[PDB]
Design a protein around this ligand. Structure first.
Ligand SMILES: O=C(Nc1ncc(F)s1)[C@H](CC1CCOCC1)n1ncc2c(S(=O)(=O)C3CC3)cccc21
Ligand SMILES: OC[C@H]1O[C@H](O)[C@H](O)[C@@H](O)[C@@H]1O
Length: 419
């Protein structure tokens, strides 16, 4: 790599977060999680720490057979599942959606889906049962409505679990040390197994329960204020919910490309990029897509991806411009990974207080899966902040559908247990 421009690096260095800063943030996140878990402060807590009612032990044993419905792009999988003593038995059918039903109203699509479910129930002689059904990936309402509209067979569509909870469970299927689920995509959230005695919103002492942190809300009371840059404040001011979800705004894919756009305009204004002239597309809110960040960071060193991204924005960038854009993208990404690791570090250090603790964390989301070096920087930062823990990270892939089927089993059992 070459000798970097000194004035560009001075602007990009603002994004740096040292260990001490991350320790502060992590420590602040832990206080906020404490507030969320306690009865007396839960209603006022910004970080809600929602009990999911997903317990460490088996419940809802009166659930044998259920349907799992995997909703994909242009098709869907209908699956019959039997849980035994657990022994997950499955059989399934892939259906392709006609363009006829793809291009109609949402009602006509779910009419089609119900028809397919009916066919599947006929094939396996199950139409007398009345099974619970869970979704995997107001589709619920659409399906409830479409089933009622049919009125031949009877079915119970259950409430979905949160996506962090689905992530943790499907990963749990492949690794029983998985006790944390995390999403870094358009938003950012995490769930983990908490001791029952810490979950004050549910009476009970024994075992563990999954808690949905909903930690994106963090920042409400100023916990992030000293870490916010001019670009962050601009993104906040122009958002749908200014002053809310400040943690998520520092991390999620929703605002990542926009932060980069603002860093590039700052550099143009300093006459350090594009000769002090920005295009109209670059001055357009939303024009720099988050997907562009990961494309720019994928570049092998030839600058063809960066040049081709920047050319779609009416810019004619020299090789130096391209290198600057790479570095602007890297600073934003790296900061997101640092902020995210402080949240996860807080959770893992808290769990450790009740147990080398060996733990698996299940992770999903476009930012985490698709961004070139994000997961790596994120891993190294989390591990740095979690002494006396050995952390394994896995992405759910479940190449047979059984992790997905377990997600539906748990959701159906919980719906039953809750009435
Ligand atoms: O069913 C569960 N919880 C519920 N809460 C409320 C309901 F209505 S249901 C738990 C959930 C897991 C989630 C991840 O953290 C650990 C617990 N659950 N799910 C599979 C499983 C197995 S298993 O036999 O499936 C295992 C070999 C694969 C044994 C023991 C408890 C098991
Ligand atoms: O999709 C990841 C997360 O995004 C947002 O933070 C949602 O509030 C949360 O419910 C979800 O888990």
């Amino acid at each position: 790599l070459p000798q970097p421009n000194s004035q560009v690096e001075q602007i990009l260095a603002e994004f740096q977060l040292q260990e001490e800063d991350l320790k502060k943030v992590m420590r602040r996140m832990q206080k906020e999680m404490d507030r969320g878990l306690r009865l007396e402060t839960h209603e006022e807590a910004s970080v809600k720490m929602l009990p999911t009612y997903v317990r460490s032990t088996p419940e809802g044993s009166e659930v044998g057979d259920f349907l799992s419905l995997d909703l994909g792009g242009t098709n869907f999988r209908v699956m019959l599942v039997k849980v035994g003593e657990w022994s997950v038995k499955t059989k399934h059918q892939m259906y392709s959606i006609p363009e006829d039903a793809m291009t109609g109203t949402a009602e006509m699509l779910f009419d089609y889906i119900s028809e397919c479910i009916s066919d599947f129930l006929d094939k396996h002689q199950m139409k007398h049962k009345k099974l619970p059904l869970g979704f995997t990936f107001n589709v619920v309402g659409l399906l409830r409505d479409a089933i009622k509209r049919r009125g031949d067979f009877e079915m119970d569509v259950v409430a979905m679990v949160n996506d962090t909870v689905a992530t943790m469970i499907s990963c749990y299927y492949e690794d029983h040390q998985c006790e944390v689920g995390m999403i870094v995509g358009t938003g950012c959230n995490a769930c983990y197994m908490e001791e029952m005695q810490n979950v004050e919103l549910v009476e009970g002492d024994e075992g563990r329960m999954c808690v949905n942190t909903e930690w994106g809300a963090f920042g409400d009371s100023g916990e992030l204020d000293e870490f916010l840059l001019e670009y962050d404040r601009l993104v906040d001011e122009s958002s749908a919910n200014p002053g809310q979800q400040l943690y998520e705004k520092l991390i999620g894919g929703k605002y990542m490309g926009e932060l980069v756009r603002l860093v590039l305009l700052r550099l143009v204004d300093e006459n350090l990029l594009f000769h002090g002239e920005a295009s109209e597309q670059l001055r357009t809110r939303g024009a720099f897509e988050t997907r562009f960040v990961s494309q720019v960071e994928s570049d092998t060193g030839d600058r063809k991806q960066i040049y081709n991204i920047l050319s779609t924005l009416g810019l004619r960038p020299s090789t130096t411009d391209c290198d600057i854009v790479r570095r602007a993208c890297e600073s934003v990404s790296t900061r997101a990974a640092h902020m995210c690791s402080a949240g996860l570090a807080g959770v893992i250090n808290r769990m450790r207080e009740s147990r080398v603790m060996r733990i698996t964390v299940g992770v999903d989301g476009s930012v985490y899966k698709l961004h070139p070096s994000f997961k790596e920087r994120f891993h190294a930062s989390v591990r740095r902040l979690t002494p006396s823990c050995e952390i394994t990270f896995i992405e759910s892939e479940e190449g047979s559908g059984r992790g997905a089927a377990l997600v539906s089993a748990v959701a159906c059992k919980k719906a039953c247990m809750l009435g």
